[PDB]
Write a protein that binds this ligand. Structure first.
Ligand SMILES: OC[C@H]1O[C@@H](Oc2cc(/C=C/c3ccc(O)cc3)c3c(c2)O[C@H](c2ccc(O)cc2)[C@H]3c2cc(O)cc(O)c2)[C@H](O)[C@@H](O)[C@@H]1O
Ligand SMILES: OC[C@H]1O[C@@H](Oc2cc(/C=C/c3ccc(O)cc3)c3c(c2)O[C@H](c2ccc(O)cc2)[C@H]3c2cc(O)cc(O)c2)[C@H](O)[C@@H](O)[C@@H]1O
Length: 40
């Protein structure tokens, strides 16, 4: 039988940064990049 205890780890109440608890990432799809030299 394992005894679970929490005493020392991470103790930070006010964060000095914009703390967004969400996965930030825009769905773009198509990106610009025209490269046609000799044989493409
Ligand atoms: O030290 C770098 C800057 O730290 C900032 O505080 C910080 C120091 C550290 C953590 C310090 C840590 C230290 C030793 C160690 O063995 C382990 C972790 C972390 C901070 C801020 O926010 C992170 C945070 C807090 C709450 C969450 O729910 C999630 C993340 C935390 C964090 C944790 C982590 O697992 C990995 C990280 O890269 C960051 C200060 O405000 C700045 O002044 C300082 O320049
Ligand atoms: O998939 C990640 C691994 O593969 C490779 O990257 C990649 C980075 C990114 C895209 C990066 C992106 C970045 C910024 C941004 O604003 C927008 C899009 C994407 C990859 C691979 O394949 C996706 C792909 C390619 C052709 C298709 O016909 C369909 C999908 C593409 C993709 C597009 C998308 O609209 C949404 C996605 O989640 C992924 C790299 O080797 C590494 O990043 C990594 O190993």
């Amino acid at each position: 039988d394992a005894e679970f205890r929490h005493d020392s780890g991470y103790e930070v109440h006010h964060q000095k940064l914009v703390f967004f608890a969400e996965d930030v990432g825009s769905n773009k799809g198509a990106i610009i990049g025209l490269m046609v030299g000799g044989v493409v």
